[PDB]
């Protein structure tokens, strides 16, 4: 009985392969060969937000494109005024082992989580002037790896226990739970319209989730090893994924298959962030080799190299205005590049 | 601007507070703690932090065994630990694969391991009833406490390959206070080694 189900699943996967291959009437390069390159896109260090005591593990940009929140295993989530380097808040964490953070679109809330298996929703605009935990969201069986806000109330989270979940910070309960990965769900990225999101798992597969259905919609694959970071293309019809296999791939949602593979024989180090620029021409991948390598997303070749860290980069958040790209790193210096 | 200047004052107050907290934290010594299930750790839901003080040091021990996840994805957090305390239930000896994995992990080739063989008395009494061949068929020697203990001790240390680190094996009967002194002096030797490395001299 079980063997019949396994055979039918194999037949279904074969049909997936056949249908995906039939639609591949061209490659991205075969069309983009008529397009001129961006040339040498050199970028330089404008500022350097010093002040973390240890390795920085996450950074996120406020929707106003000025405040940036950084989280480090020193146990402090500090909010930076990026135009003046002034530190605005120094939030003490209940545990030092933070691995992700998020800045709410309204700017009212700052999320934080890590090996605690608990996601803390800090409230910034408290009447008493201090910043205090609003909720301590709990229920994952493993470390919360990445979290993002859809609005001030409901936060989506991704955890090492092969699950992504959608919370309500108004009640602390899960409104919906997403399951289906085999490995740890290392990273997550919400689409620009927040109607749906993608997550990359340590089983080298990336999935498309629908927050209102509560179920998967499409599944993507193609890296040899775990996906470390993932981010939507700003048009909402594609997303880039960066694996530990020292390559970044661009997956089209409507074409249901990988379109391009950014890699270079000099590279052996794993990816750690795959954020785009606002026009989508530039994919500012960040590498464990201490460098951020800007790939021209359509010509599929290197546009430039950004360097300066004495240790691996942990984030490559691009401002919502496209004005600057921040790069936190394990040497505690969150440089601002523009 | 008479508004921005007060924000600048706020930034230099909280920067000072960050520096003071860092100075306070610098006195602690962080040790990772590992071992098999029920294997001696308890005698000596997420991360289980525990801490103590000895000779004005403030040792922090992390029992990370609660993480039901691949080591590879979170072990990089502990890249900065001073030492790894590894425990073995000698009365059992299946942990050698875990030791092999953790000793040559990409992040720990420079971090020395402290290795407590634990429940040694139960092992000695078991030797009077079962040969060491039962947990190690390859064993070639007499059935006695001292030789079997030395054998498994060398067997654990034989897993290291990188010369950049040392294994400070030790034995405990889980009925003595000597554990704190042993860890303190081993950590003192470890810190001296790290200091000599920093001087470009080690």
């Amino acid at each position, epitope marked *: 009985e079980l063997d019949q189900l396994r055979q039918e699943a194999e037949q279904l996967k074969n049909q997936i392969r056949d249908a995906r291959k039939a639609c591949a009437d061209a490659t991205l390069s075969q069309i983009t060969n008529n397009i001129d390159p961006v040339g040498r896109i050199q970028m330089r260090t404008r500022r350097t937000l010093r002040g973390h005591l240890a390795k920085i593990y996450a950074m996120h940009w406020g929707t106003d494109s000025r405040l940036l929140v950084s989280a480090s295993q020193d146990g402090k989530l500090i909010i930076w005024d990026s135009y003046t380097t002034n530190k*605005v808040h120094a939030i003490p964490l209940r545990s030092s082992w933070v691995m992700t953070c998020a800045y709410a679109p309204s700017g009212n809330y700052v999320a934080c989580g890590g090996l605690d298996n608990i996601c803390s929703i800090y409230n910034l605009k408290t009447r*008493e*002037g201090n910043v205090r935990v609003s909720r301590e969201l709990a229920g994952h069986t493993g470390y919360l790896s990445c979290c993002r806000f859809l609005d001030d109330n409901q936060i989506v989270t991704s955890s090492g226990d092969t699950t992504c979940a959608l919370w309500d910070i108004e009640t602390g309960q899960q409104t919906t739970t997403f399951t289906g990965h085999t490995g740890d769900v290392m990273s997550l990225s919400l689409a620009p319209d927040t109607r749906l999101f993608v997550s990359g798992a340590c089983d080298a597969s990336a999935k498309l989730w629908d927050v209102r259905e509560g179920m998967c919609r499409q599944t993507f694959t193609g890296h040899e090893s775990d996906i470390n970071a993932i981010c939507f293309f700003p048009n909402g019809n594609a997303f880039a994924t960066g694996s530990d296999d020292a390559t970044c791939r661009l997956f089209d949602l409507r074409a249901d298959q990988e379109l391009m593979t950014y890699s270079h024989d000099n590279i052996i180090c794993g990816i750690t962030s795959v954020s785009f620029s606002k026009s989508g021409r530039l994919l500012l991948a960040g590498y464990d080799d201490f460098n951020c390598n800007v790939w021209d997303a359509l010509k599929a070749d290197r546009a430039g190299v950004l360097a300066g860290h004495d240790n691996r980069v942990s984030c490559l958040g691009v401002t919502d205005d496209g004005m600057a790209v921040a790069t936190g790193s394990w040497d505690s210096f969150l440089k601002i590049w523009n | 601007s*008479a508004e921005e200047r007060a*924000a600048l004052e706020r930034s230099k107050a909280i920067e000072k507070n960050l520096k003071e907290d860092g100075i306070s934290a610098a006195k602690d010594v962080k040790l990772l703690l590992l071992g098999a299930d029920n294997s001696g750790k308890s005698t000596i839901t997420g991360i289980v932090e525990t801490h103590f003080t000895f000779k004005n040091l403030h040792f922090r021990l992390f029992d990370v065994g609660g993480q039901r996840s691949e080591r590879k994805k979170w072990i990089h957090c502990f890249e900065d630990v001073t030492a790894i305390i590894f425990c073995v239930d000698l009365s059992d000896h299946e942990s050698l694969m875990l030791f092999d994995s953790i000793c040559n992990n990409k992040f720990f080739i420079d971090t020395s391991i402290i290795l407590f063989l634990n429940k040694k008395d139960l092992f000695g009494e078991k030797i009077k009833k079962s040969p060491l061949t039962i947990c190690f068929p390859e064993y070639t020697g007499p059935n006695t406490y001292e030789d079997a203990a030395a054998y498994i001790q060398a067997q654990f240390e034989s897993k290291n390959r990188s010369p950049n680190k040392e294994i400070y094996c030790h034995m405990t009967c889980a009925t003595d206070t000597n554990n704190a002194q042993v860890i303190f002096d081993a950590v003192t030797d470890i810190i001296i080694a790290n200091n000599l490395r920093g001087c470009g001299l080690y």
Partner: single-chain antibody
Amino acid sequence: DVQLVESGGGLVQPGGSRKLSCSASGFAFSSFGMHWVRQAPEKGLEWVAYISSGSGTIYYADTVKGRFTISRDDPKNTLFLQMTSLRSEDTAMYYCVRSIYYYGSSPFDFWGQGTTLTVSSDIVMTQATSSVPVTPGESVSISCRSSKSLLHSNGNTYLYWFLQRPGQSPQLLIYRMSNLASGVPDRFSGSGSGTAFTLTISRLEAEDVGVYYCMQHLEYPLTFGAGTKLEL
């Protein structure tokens, strides 16, 4: 709830001395600044003194510098104003005003109840109108002007608007001349640029009767306008 109460008023002989204290509860007093603002018995507000968080910096009004001294006991959540050589002009009700400064912060957001104490080159703020008779349902307008342009080069314009209801302490309504204060209805709206500012009230209700003071924060000492009475 956040609460501020001050004490130490009464009648003092001219030339004497007195200590006024401000007691804070329900908020992180150590991280807030504190100001003193005083009101003559039938006149608009006037500024007195400042003290920053952690006692780092202090400022005084020109009419007061050296006559008063301001200090705070942060662990006791208490601010002190030590006062000497009281002149006939020093009779006023004194309000304790909190403030906190960072990007996106709202200074002067909460005011104490005030203590009646009586005795036996700066930017000048001016309002073109003294009284405006008005009725509910209609819109209302109040306007204020500055001798120097408040729009600093960094893009902030530091005009502030306070509403004082009869028999009560002032409350913040509009800060930095465009932003709406926390907890005030949406009926109010600031506007203007450079040296002229306007506060517009849409669909007025009787709850908004009182005196509206414009204020600048571009430089110390801070200065209040003479106040426009929106009278029912």
